[PDB]
Structure formats: C-alpha cells, structure tokens
Amino acid sequence: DVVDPDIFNRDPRDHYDLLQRLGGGTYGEVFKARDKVSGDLVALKMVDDDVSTLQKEILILKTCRHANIVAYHGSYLWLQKLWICMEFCGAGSLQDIYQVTGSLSELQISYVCREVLQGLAYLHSQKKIHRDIKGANILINDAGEVRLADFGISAQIGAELARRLEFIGTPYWMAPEVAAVALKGGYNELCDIWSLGITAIELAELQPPLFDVHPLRVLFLMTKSGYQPPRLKEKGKWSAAFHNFIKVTLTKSPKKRPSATKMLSHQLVSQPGLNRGLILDLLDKLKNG
Amino acid sequence: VDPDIFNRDPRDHYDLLQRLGGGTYGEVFKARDKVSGDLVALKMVKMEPDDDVSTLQKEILILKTCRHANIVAYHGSYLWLQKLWICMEFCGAGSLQDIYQVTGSLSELQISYVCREVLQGLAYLHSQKKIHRDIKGANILINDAGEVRLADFGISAQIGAELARRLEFIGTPYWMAPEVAAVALKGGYNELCDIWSLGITAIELAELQPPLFDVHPLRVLFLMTKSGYQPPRLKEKGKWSAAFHNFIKVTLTKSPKKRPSATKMLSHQLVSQPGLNRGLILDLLDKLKNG
Ligand SMILES: Nc1ncnc2c1ncn2[C@@H]1O[C@H](COP(=O)(O)OP(=O)(O)NP(=O)(O)O)[C@@H](O)[C@H]1O
Ligand SMILES: Nc1ncnc2c1ncn2[C@@H]1O[C@H](COP(=O)(O)OP(=O)(O)NP(=O)(O)O)[C@@H](O)[C@H]1O
Ligand SMILES: [Mg+2]
Ligand SMILES: [Mg+2]
Ligand SMILES: [Mg+2]
C-alpha cells in the first residue's frame, strides 16, 4: 500500500492556524485549529510502525459518515507526521467534561449509551471494531452531539481483516481454543459492548472499576477462572434498568453478550425522555454552574 | 540474540555427518565434536532479512533456560554466514513420527510411557510459565537409550516473540473485555493447549494419524471453532483399556476451563502405572531394526 490518493502532501499549517493543544497521549497531539481563509474551527490530530498501516486510522474515519462518529475533513502527510483533520468538538471528551462537572445523571448516561450504541451498530455493520470505547474517546460538540473518536486501535483491527488467513502452526494438534484464535482472532465486535458497560460505570462514578489496582494485576485477574463482572458501587442511586443494562453489557461470555442492535432495544436506552437537552444541560453545567 | 552465541563456522568445532530432517526452513545434522568425539545434533536455520530476529532469540533462550531430562538439552549456538546453528543433544532414534512410520502403531503401554515422560516435560515447562504449543509425534525425540525428549520450540518462539512485542503497546486494561484481556496477555489461550495436543498425539501414536488428517486443514480449523464440534476418540474401542479411553477423553476436554493440568494428569491411572520405563521404547526400537 502507498499513501491514500486523497491525502494532501503539504504542511497543514499552510491552511490552519494552531490555537491550543486539546490533548493527545504520549505519542500524538490534537490541536484546536482555525482555517486561515474560512475562519472555521477544526481539530488536527498528529498521529517504529508503518506509514501505510498508520494511515488505516484515516481510512476508517474517512469511510465513516454517521452522526455518532466524529466527522472527517481531511488528512496531510508532511515530513515526519501524519495529520487527521476532523470536526472540532467544543466540549472535548466526556472525561474532559466529567472531570469538571462530576458524575453524570442516569438520564444523561442513558443518552450517551444510546448514541454510542448507534455509532457502534453502524461500525459493526461495516465489520469494524472500535476496541477503545471509553469516556476519553467519546466527544461532545456544542450542538450536544455524541461522537465516537480515536480509531487508532481500530485501525489495527481493520488492517488484519483486509489480509488473508495466515497461520502459525498445524491445525490437527491445535486445541479448539487455539484454533478459534488462529481463525477468528481472540475476540470480535462484542468487545465494544463490554467496554460501553464499563464506560457507563465510568460516567457514573468518575472512574472505571478497579482503577486503583495495578494494570497487570487487573489483566491477570480478568484472565483468571471465575472473574466477577464489575457492578455499580452504590445500588440505591440507580434504577433497576441501569443495573440491568450494566449486567447484560458486562456479560462475561462473548457468545452470550448482546449485540449493539439488540442493546438498542433495552429499556434504559429506549426511554421516552432521552433527548439532546440532557447534553445541553451538561454543557451548561460545564460552562458555569 | 544470545549474548554467548558463537559468531563462527560450526565446522571449526564439529564434523557434519548425516541429515536427520528439517521442515521447510532449514536442516538438522548429526555431528561429531572434533575434540571430545561426543555426538550432537546441529539444527541449521536460515536468517532472511525480513525475518525479525526476535523469534530466533526466543527459541534459543527457551532451550537455554530449560534444565529438565525430558527436554532436549542445549549446548550452544552458532551464527555463520547468516545461518543460525543450534547445537543440541543427539537423539539417535529421531522422532516418534520417524519411528512409527516404520514400526507401525505403538502399544498402549508404549504410549503410556511416552505420555508420562511428555507430561513430566510439560509440567516443568508450565512451571516456567512456558508453552510448547507444538506437541506432536514429530516433535518428540527418542535417543538410543529409549528416553523421551521434547524438542522444536520454533512455534513457541514465534508466539512468544509476538506477545512480548505486543505487550509493550497494549495500553490501560480497565475498559477491556476479558476476551480482549486474554489476547493481550497471551494470544487468547493458556498452557492447557499442550494437554490437548498430547491427547491428540496419543491418538496419533495409536493410529499413525491425528484425528481428521483426511480433512483439509482450513476445514478442520473451521469445524473446530464451531459450537458443537465433538472431541475425537480412538477409532477402535476394543484395542485399548478403559484407562486409555479415559485418558483421551479427559485430555481432550473442549473447555480450557475444565481441562486437567499437566501435574493433575500425572496422577492419572494410565501414566501412574507401575511397569512404565524406557524398556518399552527399546522394544519399539528393536522392532525397527528387524521385523
Ligand atoms: N475532534 C476533536 N475535537 C475536540 N477534542 C478532541 C478531538 N479529538 C480529540 N480530542 C481531544 O484530544 C484527545 C485526543 O485523543 P485521541 O483522539 O484518542 O488521540 P490519541 O493519540 O489516541 N490520544 P490517546 O487517548 O492516548 O489514544 C481526546 O481525548 C480529546 O480530549
Ligand atoms: N536433537 C536431535 N537429535 C536427533 N534428531 C533430531 C534432533 N532434532 C531434530 N531431529 C530430527 O530432525 C527433525 C527436525 O525438525 P524439528 O526440529 O522438529 O522442526 P523443523 O523441521 O526445524 N520445523 P517444523 O517443520 O515445524 O518441524 C525432527 O523431526 C527429527 O526427525
Ligand atoms: Mg484516546
Ligand atoms: Mg487512541
Ligand atoms: Mg518439528
């Protein structure tokens, strides 16, 4: 693969002024930027590995045109950096937000869950897996819209699915669980359903479950026999519908965990009363009081 | 790779004799130590430039840090003209596959002794948090004394190198589904895959073929993944005791959740039998040189 034809071979700063760092992890920064001619605001993401495999994130975002997935504007290849130009979501991520406003209301969490689920149903119908669903990767814009973002790890999934079936060993002596991994990989899209369940707890309690425990310990625990799916800490603050939502999304067995589409029929996210005003309230609270 | 690898021609230390095998990516030679006269096996591996060396490091290192009788012994390594040479213990009878392709199917007692010795090797490995991942008759070597040695940690090395490499870049785990977490730590299975392969190997030793060997490989992969695939059984019910039938049944437990560990299997009736010794394989080797 060579760099996608639609990518711009120029310096993004020829088109945009950089105003502020919006964050980004250890390896790449996201900038609030402004179009030098239009005056329109965008977000520029500046994303060893491989150029042709790193750009998979661009392809994913570019081929997504759904109201619950962050909108793609364009991409640049300049010197030692790949840039993604996307819609600027003014309130940033849900994590950015709740770190200021505190825990979300149940109705607000319900609304986020519904919108994430719609994004996930879209993605999964295209045989895409997000693989990194969490507060920090769900963005809110000024119109109170909920947008999935950060398809870096998703790009690793998509890259494997475009390629043929390659093997390590011989099947006849393989254990059935070795066979499954070798064939289908160790997981599928239903892993996003679990992550959403954890995200809902995160929005409710400002931390994912077991956050204070060493990561490697958590990883070892999750792989033990008899791992207990997480629950909401305070049982009284939340409705039975919410407890049930958490319960089924956090179904241990991938074969019995409900799909995004099935989850969209769950009572918690089909509540009459779920509306964008819930998010506009959050944005007001973020703004002032 | 190894920090004690010899960057020199192995032929400075050994005279090469016969070819003993080799899949598609190299060869194995019987060799003689020019100083001591002792006989070894030299496994040669081709190092092509798009093959990241991390795999080959892992293999030697797995072999280097194993001290157990039922694991083929490691002596040293040579890097010469982009060829990796692994010097190891010479097992003059070759592999169980090499042997049964001449002698024919093994007796139940002979299979029991092999299983015990492998389970001793596997128990040790899993106590080193290592997985062979390639247990099969071609990878079980027999020396002239009738003793059993696990070998060929090539696949183990590959999977191992991949995992250590991916571990570094797997981020925070708190939002991961257990199945995602399982993949992160270890490719989505555990050491109990070795017990399954041994069970298959016992059937292979009994019938000269693994189950479904007449079925196309990709189809077998497919069929095994499908919910409702039923574990194999020995073809003939009457050639084998109930202890053997149960050994197969219990090692070939589909769920990696209820499949017995190595050490648990060592207490199984079939391998805890008195009368299990290298004499049983010496019998097989006798059969190999006459009738
Ligand atoms: N389009 C956007 N509009 C507004 N804020 C954004 C936008 N994209 C990202 N951000 C913010 O900047 C962060 C960038 O994270 P992300 O897009 O996941 O890139 P990343 O390199 O993968 N960082 P990481 O979270 O470590 O994976 C997000 O968590 C938000 O806080
Ligand atoms: N130490 C040894 N002593 C005697 N014969 C050996 C020894 N090591 C290997 N052999 C023989 O040579 C073969 C070498 O193959 P092996 O080392 O198992 O894997 P490989 O051929 O290098 N790759 P693969 O195709 O996956 O088996 C064995 O099956 C034996 O027949
Ligand atoms: Mg992120
Ligand atoms: Mg990311
Ligand atoms: Mg082999």
Cβ atoms B164, A122 nearer than 8 A? no
Cα–ligand 1 centroid distance for A43 (angstroms) = 9
Give chain A's end-to-end CA distance (angstroms, integer). 51
The minimum CA-CA distance between B224 and chain A, rounded to whole Å, is: 5
Ligand 1 pocket member A30 (CB < 6 A)? yes
HEC string for B75-126: EEEEEECCEEEEEEECCCCEEHHHHHHHHCCCCHHHHHHHHHHHHHHHHHHH
A-chain CB neighbours of B133 within 8 Å are 169, 178
| A143 Cα–ligand 4 center, Å | 24
Does the C-beta of A124 come closer than 6 Å to ligand 1? no
DSSP E strand boundaries for chain B: 14-21, 26-33, 39-46, 74-80, 83-89, 94-95, 140-142, 148-150
Interatomic CA distance for residues A106 and A239, integer angstroms: 8
* Ligand 2 site-directed mutation target among B51, B70, B141, B147, most atoms within 8 Å of CB: B141
DSSP result, chain A: ----TTSB-S-GGGTEEEEEEEE--SS--EEEEEETTT--EEEEEE----HHHHTHHHHHHHH---TTBPPEEEEEEETTEEEEEEE--TT-BHHHHHHHH-SPPHHHHHHHHHHHHHHHHHHHHTT------SGGGEEE-TT--EEE---HHHHHHHHHHHS----SS-GGGS-HHHHHHHHH-S--THHHHHHHHHHHHHHHHSS-TTTTS-HHHHHHHHHSTTPPPP--S-TTSS-HHHHHHHHHHT-SSTTTSPPHHHHTTSGGGS-TT--THHHHHHHHHHH--
* Chain A, nearest residue to B257 by Cα: A225
Reply yes or no on whether B134 is catalytic: yes
For A14-30, letters b (16+ CB in 10 Å) and e give: ebbeeeeebeeeeebeb
Q: Is the CB of residue B230 less than 8 Å away from at least one CB of chain A?
A: no
Residue at token pair 């071979």: A9
The residue whose C-alpha atom lies closest to atom 14 belonging to ligand 1 is: A24
Residues in chain B, overall count: 291
Of the residues B134, B144, B214, B286, only one is catalytic, namely B134
CA atoms within 13 A on the CB side of A258: 17
A173: nearest CB among B136, B159, B177: B136
Q: Which residues of B touch A198 (CB under 8 A)?
A: 174-175
Which of chain A's residues have a Cβ under 8 Å away from the Cβ of B212?
Answer: 172
Beta B14-21 vs A146-148: how paired, if at all?
A: unpaired
- Give Cα A16 distance to the centre of its chain: 26
Q: Bridge-partner residues for B43, per DSSP?
A: B28, B86
When CB atoms are compared, the residue of A173, A198, A209 closest to B200 is A173
CB contact burial A53-67 (16+ within 10 A = b; e otherwise): ebbbbbbbbbebeee
Asked how this structure was determined, the answer is X-ray
B177–A199: do the CB atoms touch at under 8 Å?
A: no
Among B210, B201, B194, smallest CA distance to B260 is for B194
Residue nearest to atom 5 of ligand 1 (CA): A92
Look up tokens 């950089």; give the residue.
A18
Q: In terms of C-beta density within 10 A (0-12 exposed, 13-18 middle, 19 or more buried), how is residue A2 classed? A: exposed
Q: For chain A, say whether B25 makes contact (Cβ under 8 Å).
A: no
Q: What whole-number distance in Å separates Cα of residue B144 and Cα of residue B130?
A: 28
Nearest residue on chain A to B139, alpha-carbon basis: A173
All structural domains of chain B, each given as residue ranges with its CATH number in brackets, are 1-90 (3.30.200.20), 91-291 (1.10.510.10)
Distances (CA, A) of B266 to B113, B190, B270: 11, 19, 9
* Ligand 1 within 6 A of CB of A23: yes
Tell me the two tokens of residue B206.
């009994």
